[PDB]
Design goal:
Layout lengths: L1 E8 H18 L5 E8 L2 H9 L6 E3 L1 H8 L6 E7 L9 E9 L14 E3 L5 H11 L10 H8 L3 E2 L28 H10 L5 E5 L2 H5 L3 H4 L2 E4 L5 E3 L9 E4 L2 E4 L6 H15 L26 E4 L6 H5 L1 H11 L4
Parallel strand pairs: 1-2, 6-7, 6-8
Antiparallel strand pairs: 3-12, 4-12, 4-13, 5-8, 5-9, 5-11, 9-10
Bound molecules: fe (iii) ion (FE).
Fe (iii) ion binds next to α4.
Subunit structure: Monomer. Part of a complex composed of SLC40A1/ferroportin, TF/transferrin and HEPH/hephaestin that transfers iron from cells to transferrin.
Family: Belongs to the transferrin family.
Protein name: Serotransferrin
Length: 329
């Protein structure tokens, strides 16, 4: 029982959140957990708000789960999204690089091309691809933003500082950090490629399938494999850049309401999970893609007792992030 203040990032998420609240109100008893919606402009404002007791929960891509864990925020992962299916839940997804058919370049010929990223610091859209190209970048590789801006001939890196690194917002002026920026996120990064602004989009394996319904339209795209070859989009399992951890809901380490967060999400998935309700869907929305939770998620899994971000993420992934911040070739 009682309220969970969910942090919505911008307008579209705020709208889905209010629908969430209302529908949960009609199915959950008076003694059940309720939702309240707190709208912020960016995920970073959501992280600050939770730490300052202005909100209670927000779902974050795993690369951002690390930042949320750092002081003075010290948030912890409490609920994880899972993909694939209820039968065989997967707590990871594949980072891939999508390109247009016959564009004529491999992974080792990315210098000078234009890039579309889901957002600064995110797993598939930034951490994995930039981590793999780190040494191909020109010195000085610090700050990272500068070297990336000089490697590509223009990008859209949402949440980056367009004032200090204008090239990173060339494809999306402002580098807006929310769905108000049409090239934000997985589907936004794909749109950036589809529209012709960029040459490559760093997204997840399911992104193209969530955006292109005809095999004929998808046959116009390919994936860049690490062996400097290209494969069709259905072959991501044999052509991906890395496997990364699921997006996860984070909460305060003190007075965090993790029990209510789990109670709310568990009930929510039972009533409004995949193919559960015709009235409301937790994992899709007429208002946008990946609002509050990823459209590709099938449900939630509780994170084990008192697990910190580092253990949750794993040594390899946390290493990759570290080596990206300081890193020596
Ligand atoms: Fe992600």
């Amino acid at each position: 029982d009682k309220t969970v203040r969910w942090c919505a990032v911008s307008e579209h998420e705020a709208t889905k959140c209010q629908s969430f609240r209302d529908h949960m109100k009609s199915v959950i008893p008076s003694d059940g957990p309720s939702v309240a919606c707190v709208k912020k402009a960016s995920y970073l404002d959501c992280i600050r708000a939770i730490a300052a007791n202005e909100a209670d929960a927000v779902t974050l891509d795993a690369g951002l789960v690390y930042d949320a864990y750092l002081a003075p925020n010290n948030l912890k992962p409490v609920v994880a999204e899972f993909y694939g299916s209820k039968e065989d839940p997967q707590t990871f997804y594949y980072a891939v690089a999508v390109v247009k058919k016959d564009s004529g370049f491999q992974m080792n010929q990315l210098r000078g091309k234009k890039s579309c990223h889901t957002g600064l610091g995110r797993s598939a859209g930034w951490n994995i691809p930039i981590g793999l190209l780190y040494c191909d970048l020109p010195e000085p590789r610090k700050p990272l933003e500068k070297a990336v801006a000089n490697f590509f001939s223009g990008s859209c890196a949402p949440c980056a500082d367009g004032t200090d690194f204008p090239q990173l917002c060339q494809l999306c002026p402002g580098c807006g950090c929310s769905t108000l920026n049409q090239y934000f996120g997985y589907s936004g990064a794909f749109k950036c490629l589809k529209d012709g602004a960029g040459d490559v989009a760093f997204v997840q394996h399911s992104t193209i399938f969530e955006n292109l319904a005809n095999k004929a339209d998808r046959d116009q795209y390919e994936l860049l494999c690490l062996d400097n070859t290209r494969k069709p989009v259905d072959e991501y399992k044999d052509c991906h850049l890395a496997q990364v951890p699921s997006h996860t809901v984070v909460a305060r380490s003190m007075g965090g309401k993790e029990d209510l967060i789990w109670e709310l999400l568990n009930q929510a998935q039972e009533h409004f999970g995949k193919d559960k309700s015709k009235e409301f869907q937790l994992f899709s929305s007429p208002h946008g893609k990946d609002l509050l939770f990823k459209d590709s998620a099938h449900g939630f899994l509780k994170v084990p007792p008192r697990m910190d971000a580092k253990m949750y993420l794993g040594y390899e992934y946390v290493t990759a992030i570290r080596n990206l911040r300081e890193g020596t070739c």
